[PDB]
Write a protein that binds this ligand. Structure first.
Ligand SMILES: [Ca+2]
Ligand SMILES: [Ca+2]
Ligand SMILES: [Ca+2]
Ligand SMILES: [Ca+2]
Ligand SMILES: [Ca+2]
Ligand SMILES: [Fe+3]
Ligand SMILES: [Fe+3]
Ligand SMILES: [Fe+3]
Ligand SMILES: [Fe+3]
Lengths: 172, 172, 172, 172
């Protein structure tokens, strides 16, 4: 090559393509979690609305990176989007616990990409990550920790009244 | 010094400086209690907002006295602001119980200063205290008593659902 | 540990606790400077309002760091807040000169914390500092330099008319 | 008363009549000071407007006491209103210095009346004084101290530019 490409390393380009896939995959997990709470034998409508919004967010995270790639003169190479690992997610608390784990995993990936940009001396990539992904990631993780703590102290998942009230008063 | 000083006793002046410190210290305690409820392993956001507001109030109580001192022609002498005694505050109820104790202690100090003003025949200081601090203090203590009673009757602190609901329905 | 803690070093955590104290201390200095200009034998009301606002700013700087600590999964450990070093601040110019010195000292601390974050490879902490503290610090220092220059060229502190006019036309 | 008189002592009544005279007299002093600054060989129009407003205030202070007297069932006995002691007031600073002295003298009178009410066990008179006169008096004295300090530090009265600027920037 592009007439526009400048100080953009191959390794950086490839790592962007992997991140794009990870984010797409995270969107998928969340999509799954959402319609799980919409089942008639589950029926926690605010849980459902919470993971649907999360699902849309993650999609937007990917499309931003797709945009960054073209901007720097790289080429987008897409891969399959894997099946979320679970079909059944058991309870409200369990689902929150799996989302916390998911987000911590996305942050390592992002911490690794940032260390690579640094090594390649790509200050434009470093700030992009720092500015649009890292602060969003710590605020996400703190929020899911808050949620898990509350559910747990209320007595979930053994208490059905506890997930019902949390759905109403916190997620509502 | 002062060209303005009139019927203002040394002892009164010194006692004002001590009160200023006590109020500053109370602000500090409350500041501590607030970020304790903002921890991910605690997470009671309305508890947090309640002690943060309390923290700001106390700061305003000090600055008012700083203002009274200059007005009467005294001189402000500041001292260190001590570490709150606790780092961990254990539960919602415990924290409310410590705040009740704190406020009762601030009121004795104020009752003692008022008795001193009386002894020194300083009617201007007497009304100032009576008007800006004593009624605010009894309304504060009654309110924390109300809170402690409710938390206790709901079954706190052994009940996590109890502090969760109180945070939502009373402090919210 | 916290379920939320990730790539957050002990040393980083401890350094945050020290910064929190420094900022609290800066708030205290400024609080002192303010009621010094409110004395009947000083009486420069805009000087007073200027350091009171500065005082509130610094408090907000601390509370932000308190927030960052919880967010990253660290624990807040508070220490005593030391007596400002001066009780009397002599003149308008002197007070501005002491504030310039204070701010330069806060910036070194912040430059040192940033170098530590870098060493520990904590890109999230690096941007936080860079984004909320370093640019605010250089704009603060430049502004106090401007003020000191003007006071000095007007003929302060030997000229009382000079501090009176500056209070009116610049700080007003 | 009188069918209305209750727990109102003779001595209290008489002391009210004296206070009424003192306030009337203070109004007169201020009236004099005002037209002194309106002279073509003086001409400090904001000085003039400041003592005219002060003059009206003092008149209102008297009329309030006249009202208190009737309310308690006492009888108003009026006396002559003495000539202010000065015809010429020399300068801006001098006039402010004489007003400070005047106000300190009015406050002693009020402190003495309050001690009398206390001795006679007249809680209604005590609060009346405390509430409508003592806090107004300390705020008055502090303000005139501020003014005297500023005039003095600017170099008045030897500096004509100093009183001119003060009239413009502070009293304006
Ligand atoms: Ca597959
Ligand atoms: Ca200590
Ligand atoms: Ca009273
Ligand atoms: Ca010390
Ligand atoms: Ca006569
Ligand atoms: Fe994402
Ligand atoms: Fe208080
Ligand atoms: Fe600061
Ligand atoms: Fe009066």
């Amino acid at each position: 090559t592009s007439q526009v490409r400048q100080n953009y390393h191959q390794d950086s380009e490839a790592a962007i393509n992997r991140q794009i896939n990870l984010e797409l995959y995270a969107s998928y997990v969340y999509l799954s979690m959402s319609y799980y709470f919409d089942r008639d034998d589950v029926a926690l409508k605010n849980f459902a609305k919470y993971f649907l919004h999360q699902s849309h967010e993650e999609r937007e995270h990917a499309e931003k990176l797709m945009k960054l790639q073209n901007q720097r003169g790289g080429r987008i190479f897409l891969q399959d989007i894997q099946k979320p690992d679970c079909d059944d997610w058991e309870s409200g608390l369990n689902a929150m616990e799996c989302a916390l784990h998911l987000e911590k995993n996305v942050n390592q990936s992002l911490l690794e990409l940032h260390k690579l940009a640094t090594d390649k001396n790509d200050p434009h990539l470093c700030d992009f990550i720092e500015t649009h992904y890292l602060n969003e990631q710590v605020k996400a993780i703190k929020e899911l920790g808050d949620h898990v703590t509350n559910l747990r102290k209320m007595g979930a998942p053994e208490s059905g009244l506890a997930e019902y009230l949390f759905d109403k008063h916190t997620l509502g």
